[PDB]
Protein backbone atom coordinates (compact mmCIF):
# COMPACT_ATOMS: atom_id res chain seq x y z
CA UNK A 1 0.00 0.00 0.00
CA UNK A 2 0.86 3.68 0.30
CA UNK A 3 1.94 4.78 3.77
CA UNK A 4 2.08 8.60 3.86
CA UNK A 5 4.77 10.61 5.59
CA UNK A 6 3.55 14.20 5.34
CA UNK A 7 0.61 15.40 7.40
CA UNK A 8 -1.25 16.46 4.25
CA UNK A 9 -1.10 12.94 2.83
CA UNK A 10 -2.25 11.52 6.14
CA UNK A 11 -5.34 13.73 5.93
CA UNK A 12 -5.91 12.92 2.27
CA UNK A 13 -5.71 9.19 2.98
CA UNK A 14 -8.09 9.61 5.92
CA UNK A 15 -10.48 11.66 3.70
CA UNK A 16 -10.18 14.61 6.09
CA UNK A 17 -9.03 16.82 3.22
CA UNK A 18 -11.72 16.07 0.65
CA UNK A 19 -10.90 18.22 -2.39
CA UNK A 20 -7.77 19.58 -4.01
CA UNK A 21 -8.72 23.25 -3.67
CA UNK A 22 -8.42 22.87 0.10
CA UNK A 23 -4.67 22.44 -0.47
CA UNK A 24 -4.46 25.30 -2.97
CA UNK A 25 -6.12 27.61 -0.45
CA UNK A 26 -3.44 27.24 2.21
CA UNK A 27 -0.45 27.27 -0.20
CA UNK A 28 0.66 23.85 1.01
CA UNK A 29 3.37 21.91 -0.82
CA UNK A 30 2.08 18.55 -1.95
CA UNK A 31 5.32 16.51 -1.49
CA UNK A 32 3.57 13.19 -2.33
CA UNK A 33 2.08 12.36 -5.71
CA UNK A 34 -0.46 9.96 -4.21
CA UNK A 35 -2.34 13.01 -2.90
CA UNK A 36 -3.31 14.12 -6.39
CA UNK A 37 -4.69 10.91 -7.90
CA UNK A 38 -6.59 10.30 -4.66
CA UNK A 39 -8.31 13.69 -4.77
CA UNK A 40 -8.83 13.92 -8.51
CA UNK A 41 -10.96 11.07 -9.87
CA UNK A 42 -8.99 8.45 -11.75
CA UNK A 43 -10.84 8.57 -15.04
CA UNK A 44 -11.01 12.37 -14.95
CA UNK A 45 -7.24 12.92 -15.04
CA UNK A 46 -5.30 12.82 -18.30
CA UNK A 47 -1.55 12.80 -18.88
CA UNK A 48 0.72 12.54 -21.88
CA UNK A 49 4.40 13.13 -22.56
CA UNK A 50 5.29 16.45 -24.13
CA UNK A 51 8.92 15.96 -25.17
CA UNK A 52 11.78 13.54 -24.55
CA UNK A 53 15.26 14.65 -25.55
CA UNK A 54 18.74 13.44 -24.55
CA UNK A 55 21.23 15.56 -22.64
CA UNK A 56 24.89 14.59 -22.60
CA UNK A 57 27.75 15.14 -20.19
CA UNK A 58 31.30 15.00 -21.49
CA UNK A 59 33.39 12.72 -19.30
CA UNK A 60 36.78 11.15 -19.55
CA UNK A 61 36.32 8.27 -22.01
CA UNK A 62 33.23 9.44 -23.84
CA UNK A 63 29.84 10.93 -23.03
CA UNK A 64 27.36 10.23 -20.29
CA UNK A 65 23.80 10.18 -21.58
CA UNK A 66 20.54 10.73 -19.74
CA UNK A 67 17.12 11.46 -21.21
CA UNK A 68 15.12 14.45 -20.00
CA UNK A 69 11.40 13.78 -20.17
CA UNK A 70 8.55 16.30 -20.02
CA UNK A 71 5.07 15.33 -18.89
CA UNK A 72 1.85 17.34 -18.54
CA UNK A 73 -1.11 16.30 -16.39
CA UNK A 74 -4.51 17.72 -15.58
CA UNK A 75 -8.22 17.26 -15.91
CA UNK A 76 -9.63 19.74 -18.39
CA UNK A 77 -11.39 21.71 -15.64
CA UNK A 78 -8.83 24.17 -14.36
CA UNK A 79 -6.02 21.98 -13.01
CA UNK A 80 -2.68 21.73 -14.76
CA UNK A 81 0.74 20.43 -13.78
CA UNK A 82 4.03 19.94 -15.64
CA UNK A 83 7.09 18.06 -14.44
CA UNK A 84 10.52 17.47 -15.91
CA UNK A 85 12.80 14.72 -14.68
CA UNK A 86 15.81 12.96 -16.14
CA UNK A 87 17.11 9.42 -16.17
CA UNK A 88 19.54 7.00 -17.72
CA UNK A 89 16.90 4.84 -19.38
CA UNK A 90 14.11 6.52 -21.32
CA UNK A 91 11.52 4.42 -19.45
CA UNK A 92 12.62 5.65 -16.03
CA UNK A 93 12.53 9.34 -16.92
CA UNK A 94 9.05 9.07 -18.41
CA UNK A 95 7.88 7.42 -15.19
CA UNK A 96 9.64 10.02 -13.02
CA UNK A 97 8.10 12.92 -14.91
CA UNK A 98 4.65 11.44 -14.23
CA UNK A 99 5.53 11.55 -10.52
CA UNK A 100 6.86 15.07 -10.96
CA UNK A 101 3.97 16.50 -12.97
CA UNK A 102 1.42 15.66 -10.29
CA UNK A 103 3.46 17.41 -7.59
CA UNK A 104 3.44 20.62 -9.62
CA UNK A 105 -0.35 20.65 -10.01
CA UNK A 106 -1.74 24.17 -9.84
CA UNK A 107 -5.11 25.85 -10.53
CA UNK A 108 -6.13 27.89 -13.55
CA UNK A 109 -8.51 30.81 -13.21
CA UNK A 110 -10.85 31.02 -16.18
CA UNK A 111 -13.20 33.80 -17.14
CA UNK A 112 -15.17 35.45 -19.88
CA UNK A 113 -14.47 37.68 -22.84
CA UNK A 114 -17.79 39.46 -23.24
CA UNK A 115 -20.96 38.59 -21.40
CA UNK A 116 -21.09 35.79 -18.86
CA UNK A 117 -23.43 32.99 -19.90
CA UNK A 118 -22.09 29.60 -18.79
CA UNK A 119 -18.84 27.90 -17.97
CA UNK A 120 -15.84 30.15 -18.64
CA UNK A 121 -14.41 29.78 -22.11
CA UNK A 122 -11.23 31.79 -21.66
CA UNK A 123 -8.69 33.18 -19.21
CA UNK A 124 -9.93 36.24 -17.28
CA UNK A 125 -7.13 38.65 -18.28
CA UNK A 126 -4.07 39.06 -20.47
CA UNK A 127 -1.19 37.17 -18.92
CA UNK A 128 2.36 36.35 -19.94
CA UNK A 129 4.81 33.89 -18.44
CA UNK A 130 8.54 33.71 -19.02
CA UNK A 131 11.11 30.94 -18.70
CA UNK A 132 14.48 31.50 -20.26
CA UNK A 133 13.86 33.85 -23.14
CA UNK A 134 10.65 32.13 -24.25
CA UNK A 135 7.71 34.12 -22.97
CA UNK A 136 4.26 33.21 -24.18
CA UNK A 137 1.42 35.71 -23.87
CA UNK A 138 -2.13 34.45 -23.49
CA UNK A 139 -4.92 36.84 -24.48
CA UNK A 140 -8.68 36.32 -23.92
CA UNK A 141 -10.51 35.40 -27.11
CA UNK A 142 -14.22 35.55 -28.02
CA UNK A 143 -16.68 32.73 -27.38
CA UNK A 144 -16.15 30.62 -30.48
CA UNK A 145 -12.52 31.24 -31.37
CA UNK A 146 -10.71 28.10 -30.25
CA UNK A 147 -7.17 27.79 -28.99
CA UNK A 148 -4.96 29.73 -31.37
CA UNK A 149 -1.52 28.54 -30.34
CA UNK A 150 1.50 26.53 -31.38
CA UNK A 151 0.91 22.78 -30.89
CA UNK A 152 3.07 22.57 -27.74
CA UNK A 153 1.16 25.36 -25.90
CA UNK A 154 -2.08 24.13 -27.46
CA UNK A 155 -1.82 20.71 -25.84
CA UNK A 156 -1.07 22.33 -22.47
CA UNK A 157 -3.99 24.76 -22.80
CA UNK A 158 -6.36 21.89 -23.63
CA UNK A 159 -5.51 20.09 -20.39
CA UNK A 160 -5.92 23.31 -18.40
CA UNK A 161 -9.57 23.64 -19.38
CA UNK A 162 -9.17 26.80 -21.48
CA UNK A 163 -11.42 26.59 -24.54
CA UNK A 164 -10.76 29.82 -26.50
CA UNK A 165 -7.51 31.80 -26.33
CA UNK A 166 -5.11 33.93 -28.39
CA UNK A 167 -1.42 33.24 -28.00
CA UNK A 168 1.89 34.91 -28.84
CA UNK A 169 5.46 33.78 -28.17
CA UNK A 170 8.38 36.14 -28.21
CA UNK A 171 11.70 34.32 -28.59
CA UNK A 172 13.38 30.98 -29.46
CA UNK A 173 10.25 28.86 -29.25
CA UNK A 174 12.02 25.89 -30.85
CA UNK A 175 13.51 25.31 -27.39
CA UNK A 176 10.66 23.28 -26.02
CA UNK A 177 12.08 22.94 -22.52
CA UNK A 178 11.40 26.61 -21.87
CA UNK A 179 8.34 26.85 -24.12
CA UNK A 180 6.52 24.23 -22.04
CA UNK A 181 7.39 25.83 -18.71
CA UNK A 182 6.38 29.30 -19.96
CA UNK A 183 2.85 28.21 -20.78
CA UNK A 184 2.81 26.72 -17.29
CA UNK A 185 4.01 29.93 -15.63
CA UNK A 186 1.42 32.00 -17.50
CA UNK A 187 -1.53 29.79 -16.54
CA UNK A 188 -0.22 29.79 -12.98
CA UNK A 189 -0.42 33.60 -12.87
CA UNK A 190 -4.18 33.56 -13.48
CA UNK A 191 -4.79 33.42 -9.71
CA UNK A 192 -2.22 36.11 -9.05
CA UNK A 193 -3.96 39.08 -10.59
CA UNK A 194 -6.26 40.97 -8.23
CA UNK A 195 -9.53 41.84 -9.99
CA UNK A 196 -12.44 43.91 -8.57
CA UNK A 197 -14.41 40.70 -8.05
CA UNK A 198 -11.87 39.68 -5.40
CA UNK A 199 -11.65 43.10 -3.74
CA UNK A 200 -14.09 41.98 -1.05
CA UNK A 201 -12.86 40.90 2.35
CA UNK A 202 -13.11 37.17 3.06
CA UNK A 203 -13.25 35.67 6.51
CA UNK A 204 -10.15 33.66 7.46
CA UNK A 205 -10.17 29.89 7.74
CA UNK A 206 -8.13 27.33 9.63
CA UNK A 207 -5.40 25.14 8.16
CA UNK A 208 -6.32 21.45 7.70
CA UNK A 209 -3.26 20.73 9.83
CA UNK A 210 -4.46 23.30 12.37
CA UNK A 211 -7.97 21.89 12.57
CA UNK A 212 -7.05 18.20 12.50
CA UNK A 213 -4.02 18.43 14.77
CA UNK A 214 -5.60 16.06 17.29
CA UNK A 215 -6.16 13.39 14.65
CA UNK A 216 -2.64 13.63 13.22
CA UNK A 217 -1.09 13.07 16.65
CA UNK A 218 -3.00 9.77 16.85
CA UNK A 219 -0.81 8.41 14.04
CA UNK A 220 2.07 8.52 16.53
CA UNK B 1 17.04 55.00 -25.84
CA UNK B 2 15.40 54.04 -29.09
CA UNK B 3 12.72 56.16 -30.78
CA UNK B 4 10.68 59.34 -30.66
CA UNK B 5 7.11 60.13 -29.66
CA UNK B 6 5.58 63.54 -30.15
CA UNK B 7 2.30 64.15 -31.89
CA UNK B 8 3.97 66.22 -34.61
CA UNK B 9 6.99 63.95 -35.12
CA UNK B 10 5.86 62.05 -38.20
CA UNK B 11 8.36 63.51 -40.69
CA UNK B 12 11.16 62.32 -38.42
CA UNK B 13 9.65 58.83 -38.31
CA UNK B 14 9.05 58.67 -42.06
CA UNK B 15 12.64 59.69 -42.85
CA UNK B 16 14.00 57.34 -40.18
CA UNK B 17 12.29 54.31 -41.67
CA UNK B 18 13.06 54.96 -45.33
CA UNK B 19 16.77 54.95 -44.63
CA UNK B 20 16.70 51.84 -42.43
CA UNK B 21 14.83 49.85 -45.05
CA UNK B 22 17.93 50.02 -47.25
CA UNK B 23 19.70 47.83 -44.72
CA UNK B 24 17.16 45.08 -45.43
CA UNK B 25 18.71 42.85 -48.07
CA UNK B 26 15.26 41.92 -49.36
CA UNK B 27 14.04 45.50 -49.57
CA UNK B 28 17.29 46.68 -51.14
CA UNK B 29 17.33 43.93 -53.75
CA UNK B 30 13.70 44.64 -54.62
CA UNK B 31 14.37 48.38 -55.04
CA UNK B 32 17.79 48.71 -56.69
CA UNK B 33 18.59 47.97 -60.31
CA UNK B 34 21.91 46.19 -59.80
CA UNK B 35 19.66 43.25 -58.92
CA UNK B 36 18.47 42.66 -62.49
CA UNK B 37 21.32 44.22 -64.48
CA UNK B 38 23.76 41.73 -62.95
CA UNK B 39 21.39 38.77 -62.75
CA UNK B 40 22.35 36.59 -65.73
CA UNK B 41 18.66 36.05 -66.39
CA UNK B 42 17.14 39.39 -67.25
CA UNK B 43 15.17 39.60 -64.02
CA UNK B 44 13.19 36.63 -65.30
CA UNK B 45 13.21 32.86 -65.15
CA UNK B 46 14.19 29.98 -67.44
CA UNK B 47 16.56 31.68 -69.87
CA UNK B 48 17.71 29.80 -72.98
CA UNK B 49 21.35 29.38 -73.91
CA UNK B 50 23.72 27.39 -76.10
CA UNK B 51 25.91 24.64 -74.61
CA UNK B 52 29.58 25.54 -75.03
CA UNK B 53 31.50 22.82 -73.16
CA UNK B 54 31.09 20.16 -70.46
CA UNK B 55 32.60 20.64 -67.00
CA UNK B 56 33.12 18.31 -64.08
CA UNK B 57 32.82 20.38 -60.92
CA UNK B 58 34.16 18.57 -57.88
CA UNK B 59 31.94 18.52 -54.80
CA UNK B 60 32.72 20.44 -51.63
CA UNK B 61 33.97 18.83 -48.45
CA UNK B 62 32.84 16.56 -46.81
CA UNK B 63 31.32 15.18 -50.00
CA UNK B 64 33.40 13.78 -52.81
CA UNK B 65 32.16 13.46 -56.37
CA UNK B 66 32.41 15.45 -59.56
CA UNK B 67 29.17 17.14 -60.56
CA UNK B 68 28.29 16.89 -64.24
CA UNK B 69 27.48 20.34 -65.54
CA UNK B 70 27.64 22.33 -68.76
CA UNK B 71 28.74 25.89 -69.43
CA UNK B 72 26.15 27.67 -71.54
CA UNK B 73 26.00 31.10 -73.14
CA UNK B 74 22.60 32.74 -72.89
CA UNK B 75 20.85 34.13 -75.95
CA UNK B 76 18.98 37.11 -74.49
CA UNK B 77 22.12 38.87 -73.24
CA UNK B 78 25.22 36.74 -74.18
CA UNK B 79 26.29 35.94 -70.62
CA UNK B 80 28.37 32.85 -69.99
CA UNK B 81 27.17 30.79 -67.02
CA UNK B 82 27.72 27.30 -65.65
CA UNK B 83 24.58 25.23 -65.05
CA UNK B 84 24.03 21.82 -63.49
CA UNK B 85 22.58 18.82 -65.32
CA UNK B 86 20.33 16.80 -62.98
CA UNK B 87 20.21 13.12 -63.06
CA UNK B 88 22.10 9.83 -63.37
CA UNK B 89 23.48 10.12 -66.87
CA UNK B 90 22.10 13.16 -68.69
CA UNK B 91 25.24 14.55 -70.23
CA UNK B 92 24.51 11.82 -72.74
CA UNK B 93 21.44 13.84 -73.70
CA UNK B 94 23.46 17.07 -74.09
CA UNK B 95 25.97 17.70 -76.86
CA UNK B 96 27.77 20.94 -77.63
CA UNK B 97 25.93 23.64 -79.61
CA UNK B 98 22.62 22.52 -78.12
CA UNK B 99 19.97 25.00 -77.11
CA UNK B 100 19.05 24.35 -73.49
CA UNK B 101 16.36 25.90 -71.32
CA UNK B 102 18.06 26.82 -68.05
CA UNK B 103 16.30 27.68 -64.83
CA UNK B 104 17.76 28.51 -61.48
CA UNK B 105 17.47 25.93 -58.76
CA UNK B 106 16.46 26.45 -55.20
CA UNK B 107 17.60 29.45 -53.44
CA UNK B 108 17.15 32.55 -55.63
CA UNK B 109 20.63 32.30 -57.09
CA UNK B 110 22.61 31.05 -54.08
CA UNK B 111 24.20 27.73 -55.13
CA UNK B 112 22.29 24.70 -53.69
CA UNK B 113 24.47 22.80 -51.30
CA UNK B 114 27.22 20.56 -52.61
CA UNK B 115 28.04 22.20 -55.92
CA UNK B 116 30.49 25.12 -55.70
CA UNK B 117 29.67 28.18 -57.76
CA UNK B 118 26.83 26.64 -59.78
CA UNK B 119 23.42 28.22 -59.28
CA UNK B 120 21.49 27.34 -62.44
CA UNK B 121 20.00 24.13 -63.75
CA UNK B 122 19.15 22.50 -67.09
CA UNK B 123 15.43 21.93 -67.58
CA UNK B 124 15.01 21.16 -71.27
CA UNK B 125 17.48 20.34 -74.06
CA UNK B 126 16.77 20.73 -77.82
CA UNK B 127 13.21 21.87 -76.95
CA UNK B 128 12.37 18.49 -75.38
CA UNK B 129 12.25 18.17 -71.61
CA UNK B 130 15.36 16.83 -69.91
CA UNK B 131 13.50 14.90 -67.21
CA UNK B 132 11.26 13.43 -69.90
CA UNK B 133 14.41 12.16 -71.62
CA UNK B 134 15.65 10.59 -68.38
CA UNK B 135 12.43 8.70 -67.64
CA UNK B 136 12.13 7.96 -71.40
CA UNK B 137 8.76 9.56 -71.90
CA UNK B 138 10.13 10.73 -75.26
CA UNK B 139 13.47 11.05 -77.04
CA UNK B 140 15.59 13.72 -78.68
CA UNK B 141 14.77 15.12 -82.12
CA UNK B 142 16.98 14.75 -85.21
Amino acid sequence: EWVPCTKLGRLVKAQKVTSLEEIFLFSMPIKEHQIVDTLIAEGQLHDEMMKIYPVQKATSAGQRTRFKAFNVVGDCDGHIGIGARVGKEVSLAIRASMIAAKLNIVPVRRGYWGNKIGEPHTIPMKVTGKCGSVAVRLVPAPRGTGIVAAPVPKKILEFAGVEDVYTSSRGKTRTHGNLIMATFYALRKTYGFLTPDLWAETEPSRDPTDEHAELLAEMT
Amino acid sequence: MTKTNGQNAARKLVRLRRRNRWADKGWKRAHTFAAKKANPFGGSSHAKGIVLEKIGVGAKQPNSAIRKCVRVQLIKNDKKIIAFVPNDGCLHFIEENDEVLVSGFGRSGHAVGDIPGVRFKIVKVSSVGLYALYRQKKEKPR
Partner: protein, 182 residues
Amino acid sequence: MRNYNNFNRVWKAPRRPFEKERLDREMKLCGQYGLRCKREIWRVNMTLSKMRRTARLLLTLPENHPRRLLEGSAIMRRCHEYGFLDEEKDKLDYVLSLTVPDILERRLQTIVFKAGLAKSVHHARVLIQQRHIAVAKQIVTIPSFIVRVSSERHIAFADASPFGNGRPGRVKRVRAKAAKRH
Protein backbone atom coordinates in the same frame (compact mmCIF):
# COMPACT_ATOMS: atom_id res chain seq x y z
CA MET C 1 -12.59 40.51 -72.52
CA ARG C 2 -15.59 42.62 -71.59
CA ASN C 3 -17.23 39.84 -69.62
CA TYR C 4 -18.30 40.60 -66.06
CA ASN C 5 -19.45 37.18 -64.88
CA ASN C 6 -18.00 36.55 -61.43
CA PHE C 7 -16.27 33.54 -59.88
CA ASN C 8 -14.54 32.82 -56.58
CA ARG C 9 -13.00 29.88 -54.74
CA VAL C 10 -15.04 27.67 -52.44
CA TRP C 11 -12.35 25.70 -50.60
CA LYS C 12 -8.93 26.33 -49.11
CA ALA C 13 -6.03 24.02 -48.52
CA PRO C 14 -4.86 23.78 -44.91
CA ARG C 15 -1.66 25.11 -43.54
CA ARG C 16 0.64 22.26 -42.47
CA PRO C 17 -0.14 19.59 -45.08
CA PHE C 18 1.12 16.68 -42.93
CA GLU C 19 -0.51 16.72 -39.53
CA LYS C 20 -1.03 13.21 -38.28
CA GLU C 21 -4.01 14.23 -36.14
CA ARG C 22 -5.71 16.05 -39.03
CA LEU C 23 -5.04 13.36 -41.64
CA ASP C 24 -6.65 10.73 -39.40
CA ARG C 25 -9.83 12.74 -38.81
CA GLU C 26 -10.32 13.44 -42.49
CA MET C 27 -9.94 9.81 -43.51
CA LYS C 28 -12.72 9.05 -41.04
CA LEU C 29 -14.80 11.77 -42.68
CA CYS C 30 -14.13 10.35 -46.15
CA GLY C 31 -15.23 6.93 -44.93
CA GLN C 32 -18.23 7.80 -42.79
CA TYR C 33 -19.73 10.04 -45.48
CA GLY C 34 -18.53 8.44 -48.72
CA LEU C 35 -16.46 11.32 -50.05
CA ARG C 36 -14.34 11.42 -53.19
CA CYS C 37 -11.44 13.57 -52.03
CA LYS C 38 -10.24 15.76 -49.19
CA ARG C 39 -11.34 18.86 -51.13
CA GLU C 40 -15.02 18.06 -50.50
CA ILE C 41 -14.22 18.24 -46.78
CA TRP C 42 -12.33 21.49 -47.31
CA ARG C 43 -15.25 23.37 -48.77
CA VAL C 44 -17.35 22.25 -45.81
CA ASN C 45 -14.58 23.78 -43.70
CA MET C 46 -14.86 27.08 -45.58
CA THR C 47 -18.68 26.99 -45.60
CA LEU C 48 -18.72 26.56 -41.85
CA SER C 49 -15.76 28.90 -41.30
CA LYS C 50 -17.64 31.76 -42.95
CA MET C 51 -20.68 31.07 -40.75
CA ARG C 52 -18.49 30.87 -37.67
CA ARG C 53 -16.83 34.19 -38.58
CA THR C 54 -19.94 36.27 -39.31
CA ALA C 55 -21.72 34.99 -36.22
CA ARG C 56 -18.65 35.93 -34.19
CA LEU C 57 -18.73 39.45 -35.63
CA LEU C 58 -22.39 39.89 -34.71
CA LEU C 59 -21.69 39.08 -31.06
CA THR C 60 -19.21 41.95 -30.97
CA LEU C 61 -22.20 44.05 -32.01
CA PRO C 62 -24.67 44.72 -29.19
CA GLU C 63 -28.24 43.57 -29.20
CA ASN C 64 -30.78 46.07 -30.64
CA HIS C 65 -28.20 47.01 -33.27
CA PRO C 66 -29.35 47.08 -36.92
CA ARG C 67 -26.73 44.65 -38.25
CA ARG C 68 -27.48 42.08 -35.54
CA LEU C 69 -31.30 41.97 -35.76
CA LEU C 70 -31.19 41.87 -39.51
CA GLU C 71 -28.54 39.42 -40.79
CA GLY C 72 -28.32 37.65 -37.44
CA SER C 73 -31.85 36.48 -37.99
CA ALA C 74 -30.70 35.46 -41.47
CA ILE C 75 -27.92 33.18 -40.29
CA MET C 76 -30.22 31.56 -37.75
CA ARG C 77 -32.77 31.20 -40.52
CA ARG C 78 -30.49 29.28 -42.87
CA CYS C 79 -29.36 26.96 -40.08
CA HIS C 80 -32.97 26.13 -39.29
CA GLU C 81 -33.82 25.85 -42.98
CA TYR C 82 -31.03 23.44 -43.95
CA GLY C 83 -31.05 21.38 -40.78
CA PHE C 84 -27.85 22.78 -39.34
CA LEU C 85 -29.59 23.66 -36.06
CA ASP C 86 -32.79 22.27 -34.59
CA GLU C 87 -35.50 24.77 -33.69
CA GLU C 88 -34.61 25.00 -30.00
CA LYS C 89 -31.22 26.48 -30.93
CA ASP C 90 -32.09 30.13 -31.50
CA LYS C 91 -29.57 32.18 -29.52
CA LEU C 92 -26.88 32.57 -32.32
CA ASP C 93 -24.22 31.10 -30.03
CA TYR C 94 -24.94 27.68 -31.52
CA VAL C 95 -23.52 28.59 -34.93
CA LEU C 96 -20.18 28.90 -33.14
CA SER C 97 -20.60 25.28 -32.03
CA LEU C 98 -21.32 23.77 -35.45
CA THR C 99 -18.97 21.07 -36.66
CA VAL C 100 -18.04 19.64 -40.04
CA PRO C 101 -20.07 16.43 -39.46
CA ASP C 102 -23.06 18.67 -38.69
CA ILE C 103 -22.93 19.96 -42.28
CA LEU C 104 -22.05 16.61 -43.87
CA GLU C 105 -25.21 15.05 -42.46
CA ARG C 106 -27.26 17.38 -44.65
CA ARG C 107 -25.87 16.21 -47.98
CA LEU C 108 -28.17 14.26 -50.29
CA GLN C 109 -25.64 11.42 -50.14
CA THR C 110 -26.29 11.16 -46.40
CA ILE C 111 -30.10 11.51 -46.27
CA VAL C 112 -30.59 8.89 -49.00
CA PHE C 113 -28.54 6.65 -46.73
CA LYS C 114 -30.42 7.80 -43.61
CA ALA C 115 -33.93 7.79 -45.07
CA GLY C 116 -33.41 4.19 -46.14
CA LEU C 117 -33.34 4.37 -49.94
CA ALA C 118 -29.89 2.76 -50.14
CA LYS C 119 -27.93 0.08 -48.28
CA SER C 120 -24.66 1.98 -47.84
CA VAL C 121 -23.41 5.52 -48.18
CA HIS C 122 -21.56 4.40 -51.32
CA HIS C 123 -24.84 3.01 -52.61
CA ALA C 124 -26.40 6.44 -52.14
CA ARG C 125 -23.74 8.33 -54.09
CA VAL C 126 -24.15 5.97 -57.04
CA LEU C 127 -27.94 6.32 -57.11
CA ILE C 128 -27.81 10.10 -56.97
CA GLN C 129 -25.26 10.38 -59.76
CA GLN C 130 -27.08 7.73 -61.82
CA ARG C 131 -30.30 9.78 -61.81
CA HIS C 132 -32.52 7.90 -59.38
CA ILE C 133 -33.39 10.37 -56.59
CA ALA C 134 -35.86 13.21 -57.03
CA VAL C 135 -36.13 15.77 -54.25
CA ALA C 136 -39.43 17.43 -55.22
CA LYS C 137 -40.08 15.51 -58.44
CA GLN C 138 -36.78 17.08 -59.52
CA ILE C 139 -34.03 14.62 -60.43
CA VAL C 140 -31.00 15.78 -58.46
CA THR C 141 -27.70 14.34 -59.66
CA ILE C 142 -25.49 16.25 -57.23
CA PRO C 143 -24.20 14.44 -54.13
CA SER C 144 -23.21 17.69 -52.38
CA PHE C 145 -26.82 18.89 -52.59
CA ILE C 146 -27.59 20.22 -49.11
CA VAL C 147 -31.12 19.04 -48.32
CA ARG C 148 -33.40 21.50 -46.54
CA VAL C 149 -35.66 20.47 -43.68
CA SER C 150 -38.82 20.80 -45.78
CA SER C 151 -37.26 18.73 -48.57
CA GLU C 152 -36.81 15.63 -46.37
CA ARG C 153 -40.47 14.65 -46.69
CA HIS C 154 -40.32 14.43 -50.47
CA ILE C 155 -37.09 12.56 -51.25
CA ALA C 156 -38.04 9.42 -53.17
CA PHE C 157 -37.07 7.58 -56.29
CA ALA C 158 -37.33 9.49 -59.54
CA ASP C 159 -40.48 9.09 -61.58
CA ALA C 160 -38.36 8.41 -64.69
CA SER C 161 -36.00 5.99 -62.95
CA PRO C 162 -36.33 2.22 -63.47
CA PHE C 163 -36.53 1.86 -59.69
CA GLY C 164 -39.51 4.21 -59.64
CA ASN C 165 -42.18 4.27 -62.34
CA GLY C 166 -39.93 4.57 -65.40
CA ARG C 167 -38.74 2.24 -68.13
CA PRO C 168 -36.41 -0.66 -67.23
CA GLY C 169 -32.69 0.10 -67.25
CA ARG C 170 -29.87 -1.10 -69.42
CA VAL C 171 -29.16 -4.70 -68.37
CA LYS C 172 -32.81 -5.68 -68.69
CA ARG C 173 -33.23 -3.72 -71.91
CA VAL C 174 -30.18 -5.02 -73.75
CA ARG C 175 -31.23 -8.51 -72.63
CA ALA C 176 -34.75 -7.82 -73.91
CA LYS C 177 -33.21 -7.05 -77.30
CA ALA C 178 -31.17 -10.27 -77.34
CA ALA C 179 -34.30 -12.31 -76.65
CA LYS C 180 -36.01 -10.47 -79.53
CA ARG C 181 -33.71 -11.45 -82.42
CA HIS C 182 -34.32 -15.14 -81.70
